[PDB]
Each structure stands twice: as C-alpha cells, then as structure tokens.
Amino acid sequence: SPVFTNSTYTVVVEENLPAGTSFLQIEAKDVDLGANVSYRIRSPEVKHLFALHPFTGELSLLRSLDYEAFPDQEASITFLAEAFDIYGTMPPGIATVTVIVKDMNDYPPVFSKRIYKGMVAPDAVKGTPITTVYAEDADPPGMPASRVRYRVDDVQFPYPASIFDVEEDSGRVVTRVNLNEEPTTIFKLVVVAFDDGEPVMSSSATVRILVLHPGEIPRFTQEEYRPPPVSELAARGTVVGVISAAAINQSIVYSIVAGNEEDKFGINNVTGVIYVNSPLDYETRTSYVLRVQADSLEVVLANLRVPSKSNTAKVYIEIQDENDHPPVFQKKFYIGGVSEDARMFASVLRVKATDRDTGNYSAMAYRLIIPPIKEGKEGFVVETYTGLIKTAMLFHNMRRSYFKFQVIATDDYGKGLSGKADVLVSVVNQLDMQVIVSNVPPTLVEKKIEDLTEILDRYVQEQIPGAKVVVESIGARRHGDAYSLEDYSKCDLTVYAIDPQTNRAIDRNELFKFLDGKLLDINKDFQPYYGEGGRILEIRTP
Amino acid sequence: SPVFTNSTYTVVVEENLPAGTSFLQIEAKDVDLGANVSYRIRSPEVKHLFALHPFTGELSLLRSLDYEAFPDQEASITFLAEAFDIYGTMPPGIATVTVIVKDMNDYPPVFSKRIYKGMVAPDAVKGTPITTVYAEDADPPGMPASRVRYRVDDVQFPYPASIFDVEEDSGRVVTRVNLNEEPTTIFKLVVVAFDDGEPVMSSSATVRILVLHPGEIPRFTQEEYRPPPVSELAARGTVVGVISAAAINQSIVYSIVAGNEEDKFGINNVTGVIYVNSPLDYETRTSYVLRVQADSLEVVLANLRVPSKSNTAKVYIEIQDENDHPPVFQKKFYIGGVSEDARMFASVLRVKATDRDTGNYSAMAYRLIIPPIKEGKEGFVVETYTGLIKTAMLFHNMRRSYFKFQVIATDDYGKGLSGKADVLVSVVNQLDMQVIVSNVPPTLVEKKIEDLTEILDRYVQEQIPGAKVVVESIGARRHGDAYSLEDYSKCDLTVYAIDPQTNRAIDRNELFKFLDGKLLDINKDFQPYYGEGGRILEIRTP
Ligand SMILES: *[C@@H]1O[C@H](CO)[C@@H](O[C@@H]2O[C@H](CO)[C@@H](O[C@@H]3O[C@H](CO[C@H]4O[C@H](CO)[C@@H](O)[C@H](O)[C@@H]4O)[C@@H](O)[C@H](O[C@H]4O[C@H](CO)[C@@H](O)[C@H](O)[C@@H]4O)[C@@H]3O)[C@H](O)[C@H]2NC(C)=O)[C@H](O)[C@H]1NC(C)=O
Ligand SMILES: *[C@@H]1O[C@H](CO)[C@@H](O[C@@H]2O[C@H](CO)[C@@H](O[C@@H]3O[C@H](CO[C@H]4O[C@H](CO)[C@@H](O)[C@H](O)[C@@H]4O)[C@@H](O)[C@H](O[C@H]4O[C@H](CO)[C@@H](O)[C@H](O)[C@@H]4O)[C@@H]3O)[C@H](O)[C@H]2NC(C)=O)[C@H](O)[C@H]1NC(C)=O
Ligand SMILES: *[C@@H]1O[C@H](CO)[C@@H](O[C@@H]2O[C@H](CO)[C@@H](O[C@@H]3O[C@H](CO[C@H]4O[C@H](CO)[C@@H](O)[C@H](O)[C@@H]4O)[C@@H](O)[C@H](O[C@H]4O[C@H](CO)[C@@H](O)[C@H](O)[C@@H]4O)[C@@H]3O)[C@H](O)[C@H]2NC(C)=O)[C@H](O)[C@H]1NC(C)=O
Ligand SMILES: *[C@@H]1O[C@H](CO)[C@@H](O[C@@H]2O[C@H](CO)[C@@H](O[C@@H]3O[C@H](CO[C@H]4O[C@H](CO)[C@@H](O)[C@H](O)[C@@H]4O)[C@@H](O)[C@H](O[C@H]4O[C@H](CO)[C@@H](O)[C@H](O)[C@@H]4O)[C@@H]3O)[C@H](O)[C@H]2NC(C)=O)[C@H](O)[C@H]1NC(C)=O
Ligand SMILES: *[C@@H]1O[C@H](CO)[C@@H](O[C@@H]2O[C@H](CO)[C@@H](O[C@@H]3O[C@H](CO[C@H]4O[C@H](CO)[C@@H](O)[C@H](O)[C@@H]4O)[C@@H](O)[C@H](O[C@H]4O[C@H](CO)[C@@H](O)[C@H](O)[C@@H]4O)[C@@H]3O)[C@H](O)[C@H]2NC(C)=O)[C@H](O)[C@H]1NC(C)=O
Ligand SMILES: *[C@@H]1O[C@H](CO)[C@@H](O[C@@H]2O[C@H](CO)[C@@H](O[C@@H]3O[C@H](CO[C@H]4O[C@H](CO)[C@@H](O)[C@H](O)[C@@H]4O)[C@@H](O)[C@H](O[C@H]4O[C@H](CO)[C@@H](O)[C@H](O)[C@@H]4O)[C@@H]3O)[C@H](O)[C@H]2NC(C)=O)[C@H](O)[C@H]1NC(C)=O
C-alpha cells in the first residue's frame, strides 16, 4: 500500500543549471512489504528536463531548464506524480507536486561588437567622455537580474584598468584619474560583462584606446626670422621671404595677428610665403615687428589655438635705400665772379645738391652743357666726385660779360633721374671792385671767410633788392691814400657784389656809397666774428 | 542520578568576542526525577571569562577571552565540570571539558603616527617611492593573522585613492598611475590597517601628500637682452648691465655656458650683474652672443638643470668707438711750393692724417706753431675742419728760402693725444721753373692733375734719389721759340720739383736735362692718363 508522507511539495527550482544535480527527495512507503517504490510523473514536457530515479527517488536533470519551454500563462507550475509497484499493491496514492521556476539569467550576455575604439586627451580631466560600451541582455526583462554590470580587471592589464573605469549603470567609459602618457600607444582594456543573479555567466571584450596623433607643438626653423632687405621701390607681389615650421604629420596654418597695422604685408595660409600687400616707402616706418603664429591641423579643426610659448616668432623686416627722389638744389641760381688774370685750378664756386629723401649717396657727379665761345676756346669743366668749379681759361679785356652754364646732378655717380640748375659767372677787373681796409690780422679773416661773405651779403641786400656778394681776393694793407705800404699787420679785403637782375656788374661807386652810408651799423654788426681786433678804418677805391 | 551523555567535549572557542554569545550545550539527565540539573565548573580562572547557566546549560561569556590570561605552558586547555542536584541524587557524574582557544587577532592594529607627510613629482613615473606607512601589530606573532594589510578607500576620497596605492606586504606608498595635477594641494589619503583573521578590527589614519613648491620654470624679464654699448677703454670691474629672471618663491643661480671663449665677461651667481673680466678692444670681436642660463634652487640642490626651452637667453654686447690710438701721418715730410706773387686764399698742400684703428672721426683740426718771420709779419694758418693750407702773405724777392712749419693733429676737433709732422714750403719764381709744352686740350689736364703729379714724381725720382714734384701753375700755350702765341688749343704745363736733401730749389737746367734725357720713355709712359690727344712736343725754358 504505497502512501505519501505529504501530499504537496513546493521547491524553488534553479533554471539553466548543468545536469546531474538532485534537488528534492519524495518518499513513499509500502505498508505490507517492499522498499522498491517506483515513481512516474504525469507530465510529458518535463520528461526531457527532469529525470526521476524509480528506485531511490532523487530528481535529477536530463536537460537544463528553460522558462520559455513552459507556457507563459502560468506564474506557478504544478503537475502530478503517481506511484506504482512491481506486483501492483493497492490502494494507490495521489499527490501533487508544484515546481517553482526561479527567474534569473537564461543566456550569457553578448556584446554588440568585439572591438571598440576611442580617443583621450593627454591632459584629460576627471569625467571625460570617450566611447560607449554596451552589451545585449539576451534575457526576458522585468527584474534586476537582467541588468548588465561593468567593471575593470587588473590581473592581466594593470595599466589600462587602473586609469579608465567604466560607469556602473550607464556603461560610459570615463577617465578615473588624470593620465600622463605617450601618444600612439594602443591599450588593451578587457571589460567583463556580468549580471547580478545566481551562477554568474560572463564573457570578455577588448577596448582599443588610442590616445591621439602627435604634431601638437610646432617647431620653427628659426625662433627669430630676419629676411634680406627689400628695396623701397617694391610693389604688390614682391616675395621678401618665407617662414617655415615643422610638426609631426600635421599641416600648419599660418596667420598674422600683430605687426601690420598699416596693412603692409600678407602671408599665404598653407605655405608661409610673405609678400608685399601695399608698397613700402622710406616716409613710413623702416623696421617692423611681425608676430607670426603657427597652428596644428587638429586645433584648427577643433577651433582652438596651441597653448604654448614657442608658438610665436618675431620677424624684423628692414628697408634698404634705393633711388626714389630726384636731387634738389639749395638755390636755382649760383652766382660767382672771376678775374681777368685767373689761371687754371682756381676756386670759383661750390655747387651743392642734396636728395630730398635719399641718403644712399656719398658723392655726386656733375656735368656741364656749354654754349659756343669765341676764338676756338672751350668752356668750364667741373670735378667729378667733388663738384668744385674751376677756372678754365683767361678772360682778358672782357668787361661786364657773363658766362652762364647749367649743372646736371645725378646721385651715385650717375644712373637715373636728373636735375638742372643755373650758374652765373661774371668777369671782373679793377674797374668794378672796391677795397675795404680793416684793422684786423689776416689770421682771423681766412678761416671764417664764408660767414663774413654771408654777413656782407646781408649788408648789401638791404640797400638793393637782390645781390650776391663774392669775395674775389684778400690781401695785406697796400691801398692807402697815396697807394703806399704802411702796416703789414692789417688787411685789404676786396669785396665785390653781383646784381642778379641784370646778371652783370654793380658799379663801384654804388657799393662805395652803400657801405659808407651805413658805417655806424656796419661797425656794430661786424662784432660776433672777430676773435679779436679793432675797428674798420676806411674804404678806398683800388 | 545525573549521568553525562558524552564524557569529553572539544570546542574551538573564539577569543576576544563580545559577551553574550553561547557556544556549547552540555546535557545531563536525571534518571529518577528532575529536569533542573545544575552545573558547576572546577576552574576559578574561567569564572570571569565564561558564565554557565545552571538551569538550561548554555555557556555564555561574562568577559571577553584573552589567551594571555591563561598559562603559556599549555597549547591545549582542559578543565573539569561537576553536576549536582537540589536534593542531591546519587551517583554523581564526572566528565572532562577541553576548551580550545583559537589564535587570531587580540588587539586592534595601532599606527605609529597619526599624520604622515610625503612629496611627489608632477611627472612621477610608475613605482616612485614617497614615504613609509607602518603600524604596530599588538599581537603575539607566529601566524599570518598577525600581519597587517593595507588598501585604499575611494568612498570618501576618490581622487587620492585612485592615484596612490599602498603596496600590500611592505606598506610602501608608490605611484599607481602617472599623475598630472596642480602644486600646493594637500590631499587626504585615509589608509585603513586590517589583519587577515576572524572578526576584523580596524582603525584609520591620514596621509598628508603635498606635491612640491613651484618656481620650477624661470621667467626672464627679456627673452633677448641688449645692454647699452660699453667703451673700448673699459677695465676690469665695469658694469655693462644686469640680467634678471623671476620665479615663484625660489632663488635663481646664474651661469655662463657659452659666448666667452676669450674670457671677456663674468657674472655673479646670486645677483646677475655682468662685469668686465678682461679688457675689450676693437682689435678683438665687436659683438658677442652670450648664452645665460637660469636655474631654480630645487634643481641646484638636487643636482639638475631645468628641462625647458625658455631657460636660455641671448645677450648681444656691442662695442662703441672711443679715443684709443694717436693719429698717424701718411708721410712725415709734406713738401710744397708757392710763388712770389701768390695772394691769400691760394691752394698750397693738403695735409691728411688718419687714425690707426679709430673710426669715430669726421674732421680733424690742425694747428701751427710758427718760428719768427721778418718785417713784423705773421706766418701760415690752416683751415680748421678741412686741413687745407693757404698762402698767408706775399713772398717777393726770396730766392731758395724755405718756410718749415709743424702740423698738430688731434681727432674729434681736439681732445686728447697729439701727433706732429713736418711741412716744407718753398718760395719759387721764374728763375727756377720750367715749361712743358704738350699737344693736349686743357680739359684733360685739370680733372686728373694729382695723378699726373704722381707720374711726374715717379719720372723725376728715377734720376735723383729723393724728389717731390709740385705743379705750380697750368697755362695755355704761350712759351714758344720767340715766346709768341701760336695755338689756343694746347697747353703750357709748368712743372717744378723740390729736393728734400737740401730743402731748397732744384736747378731748372738739371730738370731740363732730366726730362729731355728720357724722352722716348716719357712719351710712352704718359699713355694711360690721356683720354685722347697727341704727343709731347717740346720743353721750353720760361
Ligand atoms: C609620422 O608618419 C611617419 C610616416 O607616415 C610614421 O613612420 C611610420 O610609423 C609606422 C608605425 O610605427 C611604421 O610602420 C611599421 O613599421 C615597422 C618597421 O619596423 C622598423 O622599426 C623597428 C624598430 O626600430 C625595427 O626593429 C624594424 O626592423 C624596422 O626597421 C613594420 O614592421 C610594421 O609592420 C607591422 O605592423 C603593421 C601594423 O600593425 C602590420 O600591418 C604589418 O603586417 C606588420 O606586422 C609597420 O609597417 C612605419 O615603418 C614608419 N615609417 C617610416 C618611414 O619610418 C611616424 O610613426 C609618424 N609619427 C608618429 C609620432 O607616429
Ligand atoms: C587666409 O585665411 C583668411 C581667413 O580664412 C582668408 O580670408 C578669407 O578670404 C575668403 C576669400 O575671399 C573670404 O570669403 C569670402 O568673403 C566675402 C566677404 O566679402 C567682404 O569683402 C568684400 C571686399 O572687401 C566686401 O565688398 C564685402 O562687403 C565683405 O565685407 C563673401 O562675400 C564671400 O562669399 C561669396 O563667395 C562664396 C564663394 O564664391 C559664395 O559661396 C558665397 O555665396 C558668396 O557669393 C566669401 O565668403 C573670407 O570672408 C575671408 N575671411 C575673413 C575673416 O575675412 C584669406 O583670404 C586667406 N589668404 C589667402 C591668401 O587666401
Ligand atoms: C646705393 O649704394 C651702393 C653702395 O654705396 C651703391 O653701389 C656703389 O655704386 C657706385 C657707382 O657705380 C660705385 O662706385 C664706383 O665703383 C667702381 C667699382 O667698379 C666695380 O664694378 C664694375 C662693374 O661691375 C667692375 O667692372 C669693377 O671691376 C668693380 O668691381 C669704381 O671703379 C669707381 O671708381 C671710378 O670712378 C670714379 C668716378 O668716376 C673715379 O673718381 C675713380 O677714380 C674711378 O675711376 C666708383 O667708385 C661703388 O663702388 C658702389 N659701392 C659698392 C659697395 O659696390 C649703389 O649703386 C647705390 N644704389 C644706386 C641705385 O645707385
Ligand atoms: C609664494 O609665497 C607667497 C608669500 O610667501 C605666497 O602667498 C601666501 O600664500 C599663503 C597660502 O595660500 C597665504 O596664507 C593664507 O592666507 C589666507 C588669506 O586668504 C586670502 O585669500 C582668500 C582667497 O582669495 C580670500 O577669501 C581672503 O579674504 C584673503 O584675502 C589666510 O586666511 C590663511 O590663514 C588660514 O590658514 C592658515 C594655514 O592653514 C591657518 O594657520 C590660519 O589660522 C588660517 O586658518 C593663510 O594665512 C598668504 O596670505 C599668501 N600671502 C600673500 C602676501 O598673498 C604664495 O602662495 C607662494 N606661492 C605659491 C605658489 O604657493
Ligand atoms: C660662481 O660659481 C662658481 C662655481 O661654483 C665659482 O667658482 C668656484 O669658486 C670657488 C672660490 O674660489 C672655488 O673654490 C676654491 O677652489 C680652489 C681651486 O684653486 C684652483 O685655482 C687656483 C688659481 O687659479 C689654482 O692655483 C689651483 O691649482 C686650482 O686650479 C681651491 O683650492 C679652494 O680650496 C681652498 O679654499 C677653501 C676655502 O677657503 C678651503 O676650505 C680649502 O681647504 C682650500 O684651502 C676652493 O675650493 C671653486 O673651485 C670654483 N669652482 C670651479 C668649478 O672652478 C665662482 O667663483 C662663482 N662666482 C663668484 C663671483 O663667486
Ligand atoms: C665720438 O663721436 C661723437 C659723435 O660723432 C663725438 O661727439 C661730437 O664731438 C664734437 C666735438 O666736440 C662735436 O662737434 C662740435 O659740436 C658743437 C656742439 O656743441 C654742443 O655742446 C656744447 C657743450 O656741451 C653746448 O654748449 C652746445 O650748445 C651744443 O649743445 C658745435 O658747436 C661745434 O661746431 C663749432 O666748432 C666747429 C669746429 O671749431 C666750427 O667749425 C663750427 O663753425 C662751430 O663753431 C662742433 O661741431 C659734435 O657735435 C659731437 N657729436 C654729437 C653727436 O654730439 C665724440 O666727441 C667722439 N668721441 C670722442 C672721445 O671725442
């Protein structure tokens, strides 16, 4: 008589476990005779899953349990078990068996990809986003056992795992510490996905973390650039030089941030050739301080500028001197006078021309264009590198004649633009000059004769508008009352003036009554160029 | 009749546990009547430790167990327990109770100090030693339960704990990752000491990690230094300038590594004053490229140099021009000649003096020291800023007389060292000169008269050792056979020479037979200074 000890059993059965595990012991006993009580289940669907020993009574697995193999309309599963005998002893017992399936991990978690990629900064702050690692569930949801959980392992790769820690719930790969490493290094970050239920099933993946590409800090060929000097006659398009910087496998974009407030130079963005954008002159500034910046391709692509000190260079562009302006004269009419007895190599006048803005020159070559002169003679010539006009030939018996010539001035020994001025040379004798007798030694007269010439010019130009005083000769005191020699320590200063209104001789009686008419002012205005000495004694006709 | 179920019990008893825990149930039963079996221990030393209920039989603690409270001569502890009754039923039972004490943590671990200090590098590599954290055991040793174990906790300080990990067995605090942080930041690293036994007892400590002190990279006041120019007359001790660099709270030690291979300059190590170590001249180099290094105090103390690019500056020291050398003359004897009829402002000679190494000058002032001259007259004077000697007075009826004067030369209009040379001036008339008749126009003679003077000097110095040819005057062709005028397009070149051996006149017949004796070579050597023209026709006495 097989009877059951208890009619209802309730056992929570773990699913997806490997076969061979025994869970429950169901026991029935024969009252009359026998310990060979046999067990049979009235459920064909769990015969594949469970295997029940018909002699001991242990319930073991033949195939691993699947909750989806059961109908989904039952949150509690109940079947029936009968018990028989070999001979067939009666009464037969009827009991109920309730199998409770625990809801946990069914399939191991599967990653979406095998290999992931990312990028980090060499100075990445705490919490920098890199990439997203996500795996599928392969699990009927609705419980915290269907939620993936991420962590790092340092038993095989301690260097990536101690630096980059994956967030627990979101799976975001952030920076746990501030890293300080070398670029172009590929790490192996093994991330193990696991759930939070019974026997944990897990897999492995690989996260390939490359840092960046170098070429971040540009290296100039020269810290301070000095091009060769460019001419002041340069126009738009003149290449004054080129700047160059080197970086590891990156393109360099150049730009000018300061130094061209007058908008004089420009640079190409992809090459670095600095060319003239507006013509430079000597009236403007002659030296510039240009600030050239060099940037990598990665910071231009990410709208940044390189945060270094060695990204700034200085360019000094100096302007050289060329031919730009024609020479100008001090006066357009240079007036001098020569005597009839004046041999060759005699000093006449000093023609001086200056450039208005050009200072390259050291000496200027002068040329003369001559009108024809009588008796087959030839006119004046001038020294080349000096400009000092000399007397060419003797001019005997020529009264009030004037020899007008033109001086051609061109800088740097002659190449380019030209200028022209007029030179008036008069011929004089004793019938047109006068002798001023002074009480001064001859040493005070000679070393400052041009200043005394200018002061006598200021004297003579007050009485008649327009005069040029030319000192012909200086001598000792020999022009007295009876033309005798009295004192060897005094002087006869022969002073002559030329009227530019007629380009001819001024009468000697006119200059006589001019210089004798203002004597009390002439004796006072002759003061500052003394040195020492006395008064002006008299003025005598030669 | 109280009898025991079993005579010997063996229970491993946990030590140092809080009181109230029950471990063993000892059971005795009365055969006749009673369930109130009472228990008494025969050990006075465990009465403080253990408390035994005389009605139920549970063994609970009254005081926590100490292994040192027991005698140390027993590795196994055994006492005796009797059992009585209220009425005193017989036979009494005798049993043995063996108490086994488990050997684990007795006292919690105690640190040696509360606060520890350390220092780290801003670029510290993996495994950099910092400090030593060590705690006492407070435990009788001889088991792995008396070994301390260190780990970090990131629940309250995630930033220090994720960066610095303490070694497990040695307690050495190393760098787990490469840190990249800011200086002067004090961290709080809580290290919890724990053993590897039963109920873990633990305490807490604090590790104060300061990084370093800044001032590592020096900042120059100028990247490129240019002192004002120093004189060439400077000696040892002249301060040409000073260099300065700034750092955060650190001292700067200066040194020169390149630029002074001739050992010209030196610098003070604690201030930066650059002074002259050897006198600089213009014969040496005029511009230097000095490389000045600035180092922090921490790298000098640790025998290092700062690993930057902005630790190098360039110093350009330029030398200005001062008075160093006296002026030298081209020749110590300048020889010229004047006529008897030579008025004032007449060109005589050009005295030229140059400095041997000084190039500051633009014009040189000359002075004359005169011997006394007859008739109350006064001697020669010279122009100040030119050096051109002019004729002072007329020299009538003076035959073969020479007027020797001395020229004083001092650069920069006169301040300092002086020089002296001799000047010989002779007086000539028509009785000592000669006339050379040539077939050349006058335009070819005047512009190159000094070169023709040098060629005539080379002519005359071949016949007599020592002569100086001075061209007195140039004229048109008027010295013929009968002293008549024939051609106005030809020249009379009056050529005169002075003998320095007597400082007097050379005879005109001597120069006549000199220049007439070598005529076929003179007509060929006169070639390169033509321009154009013909031959030399004749030589006629004036
Ligand atoms: C800027 O750009 C330049 C040029 O573009 C880069 O230079 C190249 O760098 C790559 C990467 O390192 C080189 O590619 C590899 O070269 C190896 C040759 O090894 C040499 O050097 C080692 C160490 O000194 C010697 O022992 C050896 O004998 C060689 O002399 C190859 O063996 C590699 O092939 C292997 O790897 C690849 C990729 O994994 C596989 O597909 C192959 O099948 C093989 O397994 C590889 O080709 C390249 O040679 C470099 N070029 C030059 C001209 O030097 C710079 O690196 C870059 N700058 C930075 C900072 O990255
Ligand atoms: C180095 O890099 C710099 C900066 O990147 C360059 O400067 C840029 O140059 C481009 C090319 O000219 C500019 O792009 C164009 O800008 C025009 C703006 O016109 C201004 O200037 C004119 C003349 O002074 C004024 O009359 C006018 O009012 C504006 O003030 C736009 O109108 C252009 O758009 C037209 O052309 C494009 C292309 O054909 C069409 O698609 C459009 O629909 C439209 O018809 C054009 O965008 C740019 O603006 C400049 N940037 C700056 C900041 O100024 C340098 O040129 C470069 N160096 C070299 C040598 O190339
Ligand atoms: C800006 O400034 C620079 C430098 O100051 C000027 O260059 C000078 O130009 C002048 C004029 O040409 C030079 O002066 C002359 O130099 C001659 C040297 O000749 C050289 O070149 C020729 C042709 O290549 C060669 O055949 C020869 O062998 C030489 O290598 C001298 O021989 C000249 O002297 C002669 O002429 C003068 C005047 O007529 C006479 O008085 C002399 O006795 C002699 O017969 C003359 O000195 C000068 O040398 C140049 N300087 C330099 C440093 O080269 C630029 O010209 C100026 N810019 C402009 C636009 O003009
Ligand atoms: C190079 O050397 C200079 C000078 O030696 C240093 O400058 C000093 O730095 C220290 C440390 O920071 C300063 O000391 C502290 O100053 C506090 C004043 O706080 C001011 O600033 C805050 C923030 O702007 C304002 O809110 C506030 O109102 C003040 O204006 C004091 O409050 C501090 O006292 C507290 O801390 C100490 C130490 O823990 C305790 O003992 C006190 O009881 C109190 O709790 C402290 O004194 C100092 O003031 C700075 N001096 C100057 C002149 O500025 C540089 O820091 C150094 N360079 C580097 C890189 O470190
Ligand atoms: C900036 O910093 C530099 C480097 O630190 C300094 O150079 C050092 O200067 C000190 C001070 O003179 C030197 O110390 C002494 O060196 C002597 C070596 O003598 C040499 O030179 C002499 C003269 O040319 C030779 O005759 C001789 O043979 C050697 O070649 C030692 O003899 C000294 O020791 C004696 O003096 C000390 C102190 O009194 C005693 O304790 C000793 O027992 C012994 O009697 C002394 O050590 C040092 O050597 C220099 N360093 C280098 C690398 O040369 C600069 O001086 C400093 N700038 C300034 C302005 O101070
Ligand atoms: C290295 O080179 C420098 C620059 O080339 C020299 O400095 C020059 O020195 C000379 C000589 O003294 C100067 O030439 C003269 O300058 C006078 C200007 O006087 C100034 O100074 C005085 C005193 O402080 C003031 O009272 C006055 O108001 C002025 O401020 C001119 O007046 C001079 O001209 C007079 O003398 C000459 C010669 O006799 C006459 O021909 C004139 O007609 C006039 O009467 C004279 O020009 C020159 O100016 C200085 N240059 C500069 C830029 O200052 C250094 O001297 C030299 N080194 C050495 C060691 O000598």
Residue numbers in the entry:
A (entry chain A), B (entry chain B): 821 to 1362
Text lifted from the article:
To screen for interaction partners of PCDH15 we created a PCDH15 construct where we deleted seven of the eleven cadherin repeats as well as the C-terminal region that differs between isoforms (PCDH154EC), arriving at a PCDH15 complex that retained important regions of the extracellular, transmembrane and cytoplasmic domains yet that also possessed monodisperse biochemical behavior. Imaging of the PCDH154EC-LHFPL5 complex by cryo-EM using a Volta phase plate showed particles composed of a micelle-shaped feature with two emerging strands, where the strands adopt a range of conformations. Analysis of these particles, deemed the ‘straight’ conformation, by 2D classification yields classes consistent with two cadherin chains adopting an approximately parallel configuration (green). We proceeded to carry out a 3D reconstruction and computed a reconstruction at ~11.3 Å resolution of this straight conformation. The two density features protruding from the micelle are ~190 Å in length and ~20 Å in diameter, consistent with an approximately linear chain of four cadherin domains. At the base of the protruding density, proximal to the micelle, is a disk-shaped density that appears to be formed by the C-terminal part of EC11 and the ~100 residue EL domain. We were unable to fit this conformation of EC9-EC10 into our density map and therefore fitted EC8, EC9, and EC10 as independent rigid bodies, guided by the shape complementarity of the rigid-body docked domains. We observe a dimer interface between the two cadherin strands formed by the C-terminal half of EC9, largely defined by a loop between β1 and β2 strands and the N-terminus of the α-helix between β3 and β4. This interface appears to stabilize the straight conformation. The model shows that the 4 cadherin domains stretch 220 Å above the membrane, with the EC11-EL domain positioned ~27 Å above the TM region. The cadherin domains have a right handed twist of 23.9° from EC11 to EC8, consistent with a right-handed coil of the tip link observed in high-resolution EM imaging.
